[PDB]
Structure 1
Amino acid sequence: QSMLLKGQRFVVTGIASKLSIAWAIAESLHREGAQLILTYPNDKIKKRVDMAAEAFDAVAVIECDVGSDESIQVCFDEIAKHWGVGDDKGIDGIVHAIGFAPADQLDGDFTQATTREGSQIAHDISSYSFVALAKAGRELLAARQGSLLTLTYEGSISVLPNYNVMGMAKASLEASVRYLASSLGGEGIRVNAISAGPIRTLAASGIKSFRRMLDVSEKIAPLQRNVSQEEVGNAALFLLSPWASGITGEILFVDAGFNTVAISEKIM
């Protein structure tokens, strides 16, 4: 409870449950005195975004299915009504916390499991959607010299069992972080990612052997534990804050050091 984001405004995608990393990012931003707009992709998920809206006193709760150009365009329309008008216009940040590939893509042998359409959807929802948000948000961001933040996973650069086409999408996503940074930096907009360690979330639960992943990680990670959503929330807060004014194009690992260790006493 400091007051680092007093009067700052953020759009937060990807809340699905109390376990969502985006939930904790919202919580961190709210704690620090920012105002929030929260998005949801459909009615089932709206139920849970509404709970988050209540807990964080969201300014609005707007539909945003990042699969639709119409949905995104309309969503940023609504946001502009609230935050695009009058004396203090603009937004300080947009949080992209959205991943999807069809479940079959992440079940078993990579070459067997990957399909043309699976790949298409994985890249579209998990990677292009970040640039889609940047396109719709550009002017709002430029007005306040805000930043974009996405979430990635080590699966982009190292192989983790079953991660498969999501690895291809995350690698694609991370390239976009760099291209957007180069594209938007001249307007004072920063673009960054957090590479989170494994955390029990709705999506996480869906991956074969994720539980085992969680166990192994704890035994590899220098801190001898996994990270919590709160720890990613705080790191996100930093990157979204004026304190990160010199940082763009950056991938920040929040994984208890996991990415730095090839083998531990897994040996034993």
Structure 2
Amino acid sequence: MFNSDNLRLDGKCAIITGAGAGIGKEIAITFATAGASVVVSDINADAANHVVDEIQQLGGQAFACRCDITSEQELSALADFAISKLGKVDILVNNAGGGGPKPFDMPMADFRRAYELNVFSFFHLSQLVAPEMEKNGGGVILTITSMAAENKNINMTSYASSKAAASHLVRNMAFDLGEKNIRVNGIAPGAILTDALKSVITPEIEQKMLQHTPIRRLGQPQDIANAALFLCSPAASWVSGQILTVSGGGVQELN
């Protein structure tokens, strides 16, 4: 039977990376307003702090922390910070990442960078957080991958393969952590209206994108936040190892 409480995050403590803007920001606000206490992390301390204020304005509990996910030291600090501020961790939303389009002949530095952003940071932070969740009797890890993990196109070698690594990591991690009663899932968004997309889109590309999208409109950070809430809520207690695609039923590519 319907139970509104299972759709809420009352008393859960969550860490959210790259939450100063875009998708992460919206996930933070939705989670905080759904009842969770949140640590808003970002490499931009100002942005992270502004999000904290908004959450407080809405009557939520939140703390800011500048954390560059591409640093194992900063990741460890982030975990220590959340535990001292929240007392425990129930949810990890690994949202920060990126990399974007790159030519095949890119320097190896750029290729590896995409792995630092989407894979190594994600795996290490989960290693840091897992013991805490285990002590509390379980938890939920959620990562934001990309449709690029399944799409095939030119100028996407680093971005697409690193996101594909992260998506498969989710399927396998679900096994190692299932015994600790931790669920692991991911969301693969299509084109979502954020500054990240704005830096690479054009009107022509936009029209083409809409041409290949059944529910004709680009995505909004709230579409992703809604999906994140469900996947991290008790309403999805038997959903693990899955990657949910939010795309309006279509595909949006640069080509």
Query: What is the TM-score when the length of structure 1 is the normalising length?
Result: 0.83
Which residue identity lines up with residue 71 of structure 2 in the other structure?
Answer: S
Deviations 1:44-74 (A, max 9, x none): x111111100011343212321121111111
Are the structure 2 counterparts of residues 65 and 181 from structure 1 closer, same or farther at C-alpha, using a change threshold of 3 Å?
same
Q: Is this contact kept in 2: 1:205–1:211, CA < 8 A?
A: no
Q: Distance in 2 between matches of 1:211 and 1:151?
A: 26
Q: Show the 5 A alignment for 1:136-147.
A: 136-142=128-134, 143-147=136-140
Aligned partners of 2:35, 2:154: CA distance in 1, in Å?
Answer: 40
Deviation by residue 1:53-103 (Cα, 9 ceiling, x = unmatched): 00113432123211211111111111121233xxxxx322111111133x7
Q: Structure 1 unaligned segments of length 5 or more: list them.
A: 85-89, 262-268
Measured in 2, the distance between the counterparts of 1:233 and 1:249 equals 19
Q: Return 140-149 or 233-242, whichever deviates more.
A: 140-149
- State whether structure 2 residue 169 is matched by structure 1 residue 176: yes
Does the CA-based 8 Å contact 1:92-1:144 persist in structure 2? no
Tell me, in whole angstroms, the C-alpha distance in 1 between the residues paired with 2:206 and 2:140: 31
CA 1:158 to 1:6, structure 2 compared with 1: closer, same or farther past 3 Å?
Answer: same
Q: Distance in 2 between matches of 1:217 and 1:72?
A: 36
Letter in 2 for 1:203: A
Q: Does 1:70 align with 2:93?
A: no
Unaligned runs of 5+ in 2: none
- Aligned pairs for 1:94-133 within 5 A: 94-101=92-99, 106-107=101-102, 110-112=103-105, 114-133=106-125
Aligned residue in 2 for 1:239: 231
User: Could you tell me which residue of structure 1 aligns to residue 91 of structure 2?
Assistant: 93
Matched, 1:249 2:253: no
Residue by residue, what CA displacement relative to the aligned partner does 1:173-225 show, whole Å, maximum 9, x if unpaired? Answer: 11111221111111000110101110122222233x46544432222122122
CA contact (8 A) 1:10 1:94 kept: yes
Partner of 1:264: none
Q: Which amino acid aligns with 2:158?
A: V
Does the CA-based 8 Å contact 2:9-2:35 persist in structure 1? yes
Q: Given residue 128 of structure 1, which amino acid in structure 2 is its aligned partner? A: F
1:211–1:27 CA distance, 2 compared to 1 (3 A):
farther
Shift of 1:141: 1.9
Q: Structure 1 pair 204/160, CA: closer, same or farther in 2 (3 Å)? A: farther
| CA RMSD across the alignment | 2.0
CA distance in 2, matches of 1:206, 1:29: 27
Q: 1:188 to 1:67 in 2, by over 3 A?
A: same
- Partners in 2 of 1:210 and 1:129 — Cα distance? 31
Q: Cα offset for 1:12? A: 1.0
Q: Is the 8 A contact 1:198 1:214 kept in 2?
A: no
Paired position in structure 1 for 2:27: 25
Distance, in Å, in 2 between the alignment partners of 1:48 and 1:184 is: 33
Identity %: 25
Residues 210, 246 of structure 1: alpha-carbon distance in 2 compared, 3 angstrom cutoff? farther
Aligned to 1:198: 191
Give the aligned partner of residue 54 of structure 1. Answer: 53
State the alpha-carbon separation in 1 of the partners of residues 45 and 185 from structure 2. 27
Q: 1:257 and 1:15 mapped to 2: Cα distance?
A: 26
1:59–1:30 distance in 2 versus 1, CA, 3 Å: closer
Provide, for residues 209-260 of structure 1, a one-character-per-residue CA deviation record: whole Å limited to 9, x for no partner: 465444322221221222211111011000010111101110101111115x
Contact map agreement 1:26 1:36 (CA 8 A) in 2? yes
Determine if the alignment matches structure 1 residue 153 to structure 2 residue 146: yes
- The partner residue of 2:11 within 7, 19, 22 is 7
The residue type equivalent to 2:79 in the other structure is F
Q: Provide, for residues 11-41 of structure 1, a one-character-per-residue CA deviation record: whole Å limited to 9, x for no partner.
A: 1111233xx1011111211221211111122
